[PDB]
Each structure stands twice: as structure tokens, then as C-alpha cells.
Amino acid sequence: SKTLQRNRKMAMGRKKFNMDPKKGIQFLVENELLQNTPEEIARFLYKGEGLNKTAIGDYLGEREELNLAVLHAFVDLHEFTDLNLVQALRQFLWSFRLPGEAQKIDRMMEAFAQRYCLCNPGVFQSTDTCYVLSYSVIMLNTDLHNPNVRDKMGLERFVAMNRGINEGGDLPEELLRNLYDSIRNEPFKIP
Amino acid sequence: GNIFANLFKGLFGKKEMRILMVGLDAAGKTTILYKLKLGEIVTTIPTIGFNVETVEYKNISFTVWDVGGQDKIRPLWRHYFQNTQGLIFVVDSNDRERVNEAREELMRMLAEDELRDAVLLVFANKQDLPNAMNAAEITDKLGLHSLRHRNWYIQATCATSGDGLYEGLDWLSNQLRNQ
């Protein structure tokens, strides 16, 4: 039944994606299984059926114009309402495997931050504050849980690091302490 | 028996020393570290976040510091630049189009107040390529003769063979024992 063929060409579209995200999208587009718009590619990645999260992360981390548009659309598919920053980050970083290059993490955190702030207005005074703090949380996860780092950051150091990021002033110590404790006691889960 | 670690054998149980390694993408940092660890691999439990590439000889560690990203996150780096005795700057000497971009990155790291006292070792890497700038040419393009109050050295290297790594680290070791 003209449909099982559709399943074969989809399963083929997803594996290729897992081997090479760009080629798998091209294959899916060419075989009319997926619309070549950033919005539809993003939905496809977000649903993530049968997709390796490392391949999703690698695609979202590219700098080409379409990939940037997809990342924007991908983050728009996340609902962060009534989540604290760490809970929102956990949900976000569950949907793809974060790349390790700082330029990619930076771009991903800024995009995350814009959305976080829209979903949770007035929690931060500016999206910049949310963006810088989110990045410092990624730094904190790395510091605390990567075994190549021997001299682990304590609370005091984490507090000192975020000095000045609230539009030249400070965030409250208890907000930073709660972030610190959440990451220390539960690293970001490996997808 | 790690030839590079033996260079630092007698520092003086002195205090941990920390060296950061910086350079544009593709300059050769990862490749150098593979040589400094002598090609030995481990399966490491994964961690979400930044790639951390470090080699520890004990009494001394070398860590790649990725300078990518926007300027707004750089205030966060400050405490890590605090206990740093040396900076290794690696440049792709064949990349004539990005040498000014490398110079600007170097110059911004060297304006970090926290690095005021760090020694500087420049690896002018990729000397095996036929149109590579040599060490004397890189020195000019990076503006190293305009540096003041900075102990600096430039070493020609080929990271894929390891050539020059020993000689630059030997220079570095002699700087760090002398303080």
C-alpha cells in the first residue's frame, strides 16, 4: 500500500539524518517528506522521532542562515511558562545534545534566554541578564561535573563570578545559591 | 616516559601552575594537546557543556581556553584567569587572511588585568606548509615587538609532527622556575 513506501523513505530520511543531519534533511526535502522551511524543519527536530540528539544538536549549532532560522523556530517550540531558569534549561537541553564549542553554546543560550524571558516576563530585568546567567550555569555544570576539572567551583566563587551581570549590578544571593545547588546535586542529564 | 612532563620535573613542589592555551579555530590546539598526552585515550563519562581539553603533569596543567562567542560573556572568565602563570597562543601560520584576527584576540587576552604577570609563548604552527609565514614574519604580524612588561617567546612548530613543542615548552619551563 502506497504508504509503506512512505515509511521506508522516512526511516531512510531519519537514519541519514543521524549520520549527517544536512544530507538527511536534503533527502527528506527531495522526496517530499518534509517542507524546506525553518518552521517545518524545527517541528521535525523538536518531535525528534528516531533522531539522535547529537545530530539534532549538531544541526542546530551550525552557522548557516537556514540553521539559524531553524534554531529560532526550535526554541519557539519550547514552552517555558512557570519554570525557573534551571528547570527551563533542563527541558531545553533534553531536546538536543548541547555542542561543546563556545560559539555554539553562546548562540544557543542567547536564543534560549529570549524565549525564557518571553514565557516568564519580569523574572529578569533584561534578556542580557538571562543570557549571561544561563551561560554561567552551563559553565557551572561543566566545572562541577567534568572530571578534567580538578579544583571545583564553590558557592562563593559562583556568586563572585556573576557579580555585575544584572545590568551592571548583582542578582540576589539566594537565586544564585538555588541554581548552584540544583546543578551540583543533579548535573544536566545526558540525552 | 613523558618527555614533555620531564621538562617540568623540578619546579619545587612549588604551587600548582596553570597554563592556558588560546588560538583561533583550526590553529592546532587540539593537535598539540594530543602530542602532550602522547596519544593516550580514555573513555570518559560524558558531561553536558563546554569541551574541556586539559593535560596535567602535576605541578603543571595546560588547558585549552575557547575564546569563541560574544563579548558579553567574557566577564565570567575572570576568576579562571586568576591563577595563571602562562599563556600559550597558537596561530595558523599559513592563514594569512586571519592573522590580524589572531593578533586582535591575543591583544585582548593580554589586556586582561588578571593575566598581567603571565609569560607568553607563541607557537607559530603549521610550518610544514609551503606558504607558511615563519616565526620572524609572525612576530611582525602579531605585533610582538610592541609588547612591554611581558616575558615572551615565539617558537616555530609543526603540531602534527610535534616539532618545536619540546623547545617552546623548555623555554616555558625555564621561565617558570626562575620566578
Ligand SMILES: Nc1nc2c(ncn2[C@@H]2O[C@H](COP(=O)(O)OP(=O)(O)O)[C@@H](OP(=O)(O)O)[C@H]2O)c(=O)[nH]1
Ligand atoms: N599541515 C598542518 N596541519 C596541522 C598542523 N597542526 C594542526 N593541523 C591540522 O589543522 C586542523 C586543525 O587543528 P586542530 O588541532 O583541530 O585545531 P584547533 O583545536 O586549534 O581548532 C587539523 O586538520 P583536520 O581538520 O584536517 O584534521 C589538524 O590536523 C600543522 O602543524 N600542520
Ligand SMILES: C[C@H]1CCC/C=C/[C@@H]2C[C@H](O)C[C@H]2[C@H](O)/C=C/C(=O)O1
Ligand atoms: C577550567 C574549565 C572550567 C569549565 C567552565 C569554563 C568554561 C569556559 C567559558 C568560556 O566561554 C569557554 C570555556 C573555556 O574554553 C574553558 C575551558 C575549561 O577547561 O575550563
Ligand SMILES: [Mg+2]
Ligand atoms: Mg580543537
Ligand SMILES: [Zn+2]
Ligand atoms: Zn519566534
